[PDB]
Amino acid sequence: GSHMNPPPPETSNPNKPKRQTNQLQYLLRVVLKTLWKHQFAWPFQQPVDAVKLNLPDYYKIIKTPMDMGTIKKRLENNYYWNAQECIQDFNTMFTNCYIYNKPGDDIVLMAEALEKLFLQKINELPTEE
Ligand SMILES: N#Cc1cc(Br)ccc1O
């Protein structure tokens, strides 16, 4: 893509420690799956393309970008050590949306719908075994 967009977050790095846990399996098979098919998922399924959207300030404002396409790759590629890393990626994605956009904007309402589902599913995150 455009040189004006940053490289996406890392999804592969042999130096980084990782492991599978039952909680990470639940984050892929239940949490990500549920959110990915929501009617309002599409803006969040890949990094924000600030060039295409004519938002030249986006990566001036949002210095820790995250998206569900990145999270999907990180889960499928076993990038994470623990559930907390992955949950933090989701939280970063939501908070970027809420800091960049005005309350009540369409993308905000879309993010809020995904967040409500997310919180329901994370309340049920299984005990680590
Ligand atoms: N595991 C799983 C899963 C995740 C996404 Br996103 C879509 C379909 C699936 O079956």
Ligand SMILES: N#Cc1cc(Br)ccc1O
């Ligand atoms: N945040 C954000 C954002 C994402 C898409 Br896709 C389009 C416009 C936006 O302002």
